[PDB]
């Protein structure tokens with residue numbers, strides 16, 4: 001790496017790892033569209049396995065960006081429309097609260113207060129149907145944003161229905177394979193387990209548990225190298241040769257709703273660049289990020305704005321991840337850690353690094 005990149009990264013991350021007690025971390029900086037990698041510490045404390053460029057981390061909700069792009073690709077293929085009623089793809093959702101709830105609302109957390117988590121007791125396809133049938137919206141559709149796995153999770157399940165493929169196969173075939181994300185997995189194969197970091201929660205080694213709509217909302221595992229490649233693909237979709245995929249990436253960065261100075265895309269969230277660091281830093285904090293907030297519709301949605309800080313935080317019980325990029329500066333960052341540490345600390349470090357290089 002250029003010594004400038006080396007120095008800001010180390011000067012920023014070293015203190016972060018110390019303060020937050022992070023066992024292991026990988027960082028990629030995308031600078032003028034070239035990746036630079038950094039790693040520290042342990043993928044597996046017990047077995048003394050270091051973090052490397054090949055280590056798999058749980059992305060947690062950064063997975064929503066893949067779901068949003070896969071959904072965008074389905075739109076581009078003419079398979080679904082964001083204006084379609086939810087019931088078009090799940091006619092068994094007959095409870096009348098679903099009248100007027102579209103794929104758009106599901107994708108963008110504006111259905112009317114779908115819950116943050118799908119309950120644990122929901123397992124089968126029939127459990128899930130009952131869950132959404134019984135759900136009572138707090139609000140009319142398209143009025144309030146409440147970040148929710150059960151909202152975008154369902155968008156992901158329904159978006160792949162016309163394709164005939166499982167969500168995993170659609171993702172593999174239409175997103176991972178075309179982008180050469182060859183070490184990115186919904187289900188980690190046995191052959192790759194050697195590279196799968198442990199998460200650490202209270203110093204216990206943990207991996208994410210199976211859950212309804214897990215793949216769609218929080219179930220991708222990836223390497224810093226693949227995640228650098230994901231960032232490059234989203235920074236410059238016009239370099240992508242697969243037409244519907246290029247378009248899908250563009251659709252996931254359109255601005256559908258605004259709350260405060262934040263705009264909701266499909267999985268990605270966006271602010272105008274230059275951003276006020278306090279606005280993203282404090283904004284990443286969980287009970288701003290996870291709070292009920294009125295939304296203003298963007299009618300019609302603004303296509304991907306190049307001068308944006310585009311980002312997503314993600315967590316599992318044992319991992320904390322963050323991705324942020326600025327299309328107009330060909331600049332981006334990925335931070336993957338096997339501890340779930342506070343979001344503001346993530347955005348703060350990312351901001352310090354990208355501002356220095358911008």
Ligand SMILES: *[B]([O])([O])[C]([N]C(=O)[C]C1=[C][C]=[C]S1)C1=[C]C(/[C]=[C]/C([O])=O)=[C][C]=[C]1
Pocket residue numbers: 059060061062116117149208217218313314315316317340
């Ligand atoms: B995201 O990342 O946003 C998501 N994820 C999930 O769900 C996964 C998991 C499992 C276990 C735990 S997590 C979410 C997250 C949250 C939170 C976080 C913290 O706390 O950190 C919530 C919701 C969703």
